[PDB]
Write a protein that binds this ligand. Structure first.
Ligand SMILES: [K+]
Ligand SMILES: [K+]
Ligand SMILES: [K+]
Ligand SMILES: [K+]
Length: 226
DNA sequence: ACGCTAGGGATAACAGGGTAATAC
DNA sequence: GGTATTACCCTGTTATCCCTAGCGT
């Protein structure tokens, strides 16, 4: 009946760790739907030749946000989030927070579903069979944006930053999102790569779908003047 | 003058892989 | 006393979210 407390600082190949893992086989509904959003967003779902099952590597600027994600996947995360400071070619110090799950079979289904030749890809049935409003909220906290950053604007158009996907992949998302959630998303380009524009007249709908899941430190991505 | 949005910046992501601690 | 495992930590690189100049109105 192994407590995770005890795994803290043990060498990777410790028996206690392998015995701890069998206390879990599949992601919860909540974890699965969260994680579908995060994969579309900011999470690395990682399996190289060296890895026996998928794990997650987490990296965010926002401290409250990474600590929230770690609580959702609490079981799978041994060590707390760690501040990392890097110098960049400009010579400026950059701060982020980092966390990792261990490898675990529970991550394999979504790992094989999303990753193909070490690229994230959009499966033709992703939207229909997997994306819920919980998934949409996480995708939005990760990769979400305003069309108009003027603080006093009346234009409440929003963006999902899908630059890393293929045009034809984003066209699938837009088509299936508009059928499943009755949105009027349309495609646009940012540095010649595809993004999802959510028009102003979808704002009340989108808000009412995702706002229930948005944590207090992420409401700003969604909030305009009334 | 003002509302929108295409063009572009320095990160804030996303990645891939080295190091070193248990099991035999 | 190699060899297999593998959590944590280190290094590469840039497409991101975010900002704003400038055009149509
Ligand atoms: K992404
Ligand atoms: K992001
Ligand atoms: K960035
Ligand atoms: K990026």
């Amino acid at each position: 009946i192994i407590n995770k407390k005890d795994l803290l600082g043990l060498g990777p190949n410790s028996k206690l760790i392998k015995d701890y893992k069998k206390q879990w086989t599949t992601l919860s509904k909540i974890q699965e739907e969260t994680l579908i959003g995060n994969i579309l967003g900011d999470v690395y779902i990682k399996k190289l030749k060296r890895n026996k099952h998928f794990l997650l590597q987490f990296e965010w600027k926002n401290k409250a946000y990474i600590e929230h994600i770690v609580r959702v996947f609490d079981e799978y995360v041994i060590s707390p989030p760690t501040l990392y400071e890097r110098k960049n070619h400009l010579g400026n110090k950059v701060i982020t927070w980092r966390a990792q799950t261990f490898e675990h079979k529970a991550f394999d289904k979504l790992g094989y579903y999303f990753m193909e030749n070490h690229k994230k890809i959009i499966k033709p049935d992703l939207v229909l069979n997997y994306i819920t409003e919980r998934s949409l909220a996480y995708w939005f906290m990760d990769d979400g944006g305003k069309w108009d950053y003027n603080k006093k604007t009346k234009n409440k158009s929003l963006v999902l930053h899908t630059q890393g996907f293929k045009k034809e992949e984003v066209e699938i998302l837009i088509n299936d999102l508009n059928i499943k959630f009755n949105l009027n998303c349309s495609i646009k380009f940012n540095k010649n790569k595809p993004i999802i524009y959510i028009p102003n007249k979808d704002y009340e709908l989108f808000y009412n779908l995702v706002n229930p899941y948005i944590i207090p430190e992420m409401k700003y991505k969604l909030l305009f003047n009334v």
